[PDB]
Amino acid sequence: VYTVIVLCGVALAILVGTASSAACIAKARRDCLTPYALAPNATVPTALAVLC
Amino acid sequence: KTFPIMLNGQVNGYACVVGGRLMKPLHVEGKIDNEQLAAVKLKKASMYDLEYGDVPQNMKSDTLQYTSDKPPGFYNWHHGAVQYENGRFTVPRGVGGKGDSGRPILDNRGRVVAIVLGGANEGTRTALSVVTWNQKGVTIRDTPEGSEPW
Amino acid sequence: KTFPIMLNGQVNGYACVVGGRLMKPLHVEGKIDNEQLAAVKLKKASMYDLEYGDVPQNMKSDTLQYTSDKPPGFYNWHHGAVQYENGRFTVPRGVGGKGDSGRPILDNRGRVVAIVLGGANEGTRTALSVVTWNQKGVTIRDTPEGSEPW
Amino acid sequence: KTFPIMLNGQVNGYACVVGGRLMKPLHVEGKIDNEQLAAVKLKKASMYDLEYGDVPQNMKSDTLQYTSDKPPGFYNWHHGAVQYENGRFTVPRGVGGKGDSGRPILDNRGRVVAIVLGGANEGTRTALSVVTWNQKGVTIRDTPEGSEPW
């Protein structure tokens, strides 16, 4: 009985950790390229150099 | 060049299509006077208080190109004139109120610069809240103190 | 002042406003024209043949204010005039078709005391059913027997 | 005249209420910018590229008629002058295109002889894909090989 709750606890912990990190860095990146610059180019190419 | 955002018979804001797609304020809701650019799904950006979303090839050239070239001088505005005060655009007394959101300004050459959010007065003549672009090509807000959303 | 009803590429009836309130006939079905005017709901009283409701307060500068007298004379109307005899309201021969039930009548000074619902022909002159007002202010129908709603 | 079909704002083709009831070509799709005629089920005939539907009780008179009358001569059309020689329909080069899917050609009297589908060119002068009645009431198809319909 103890090993099933320990294993499901650590499995749900690592997946909710990866999900929280994914949503965290997803919001922190999507409020970063919001300067879109139609008439110029990419703002400083270090950002899309990090990305692509 | 103009597309309103109204709701149930009162003015709330006026959208524009700049350089290839459109934008719209976030404190302004309801009806917009098209079904082409209403059908698109829009991405909202809370930090600049304007959403963005692409328009199809049907609007390939009816848009208005933009710049960042603001030397000191008088330019034209939809309900009057402006004054370049060191990056702080401003509106004559009493002119401009509720239902004047997203109104663009226009230069002497046919170039758009500023998008509006609200306004606040300091002394003799009322300052306004600007969304503009710089010579480097990144966007700015210059919001006065106590500028409630119109 | 008279706002029509959208049916299928035609008009079925019409609707007007009075005193800050709204009209509709029971026999008249269909969607009304204006954005602020449809979204308010109808506390309906169908056996008194009027579907009232409260209008937006931005419509406070379009409604009318009345008294309840009807002195003898003549009352102008969209299809000419309507005459005042027998304490009644009767339309001449041939004039008056279908779909005009909902639209008001007027006098020289321009105030509605009466709105049209039906019709009944005996020989030449046609007696149509009229909602009018008491000096106590309660709704009144002068319906002939064997009437016919338009 | 004819009634157009609006996909996403702009022109696609023309729906012909012709000969008593409604026809629209199956090559182009979209909906009609007229509300009373699209409030019913419309059956299809995918054999020879036309759709068959009803009309309401107010389009029998003004609908232009068809009589399959063929004297070989110069007829007329909104973008030139189509004529019938050798058992063919022809227009010179640099004409039509997409958006012109279903505009009919007429005669000197003022009634229809044929409804155009489109086509392409193979030779010194452009042939047209058409749906045209004959003497025995047959809607025979005249379309040269190698011509996709407009």
DSSP secondary structure string for all residues of D43-61: EEETTTTEEEE---TT-SS
Backbone angles phi, psi at B15, to 5 degrees: -90, 170
**Cβ contact A35–B52 (<8 Å):** no
Nearest to B66 among A35, A39, A41 (CB): A39
E-only strand ranges, B31-148: 31-32, 43-45, 50-54, 76-77, 80-81, 90-91, 105-106, 115-122, 125-133, 139-142
Can chain B be said to touch chain A, i.e. do they have 3 or more Cβ pairs within 8 angstroms? yes
Give A28→chain B minimum CA distance, Å: 12
E-only strand ranges, C63-143: 74-77, 80-85, 88-91, 115-116, 126-127, 130-133, 139-141
B118, B119, C76, D48 from B101: Cα distances, Å:
7, 11, 46, 54
Two structure tokens written together for C30 = 């269909």
Backbone angles phi, psi at B86, to 5 degrees: 60, 35
**Cβ contact B31–C34 (<8 Å):** no
**Cβ contact A36–B67 (<8 Å):** no
Which of the following is catalytic: B49, B100, B129, B147? B49
Q: Exposed (0-12), middle (13-18) or buried (19+): which is D19, by Cβ within 10 Å?
A: middle
d(CA D4, CA D33): 7
Chains linked to D by 3 or more Cβ pairs within 8 Å: B, C
Q: Exposed (0-12), middle (13-18) or buried (19+): which is C56, by Cβ within 10 Å?
A: middle
Can chain A be said to touch chain C, i.e. do they have 3 or more Cβ pairs within 8 angstroms? no
**Cβ contact B8–C34 (<8 Å):** no
- Number of other residues whose CB lies within 10 A of the CB of residue C6: 14
B-contacting residues in D 101-120 (Cβ below 8 Å) = none
**Cβ contact B47–A41 (<8 Å):** no
The β-bridge partners of D77 are: D80
Which residue of chain D has the CA closest to C8?
D36
Give C122→chain B minimum CA distance, Å: 46
Determine how β-strand C126-127 pairs with β-strand C88-91. Answer: antiparallel
A13, C41, C145, D53 from C36: Cα distances, Å:
53, 11, 38, 37
Are the CB atoms for C133 and C66 separated by under 8 Å?
yes
d(CA B29, CA B10): 11
Are the CB atoms for B89 and B105 separated by under 8 Å?
yes
Suggest the residue from D7, D8, D11, D12 to mutate for an interface test with chain B (most B CBs closer than 10 A).
D8
Among positive and negative, which fits the CA dihedral B122, B125, B131, B132? Answer: negative
B-contacting residues in D 8-27 (Cβ below 8 Å) = 8-10
B79 tagged catalytic: no
Inter-residue long-range contacts of D137-144, CB under 8 Å, 24+ positions, other chains counted: D137/D68, D139/D48, D141/D48, D142/D87, D142/D88, D142/D89, D143/D117, D143/D119, D144/D119
- Number of other residues whose CB lies within 10 A of the CB of residue A37: 15
For chains C and D, count residue pairs whose Cβ atoms are closer than 8 Å.
Answer: 7
- Gaps in chain D (C to N over 2.5 angstroms) fall after none
**Cβ contact D10–B58 (<8 Å):** yes
d(CA B24, CA B22): 7
d(CA D51, CA D68): 20
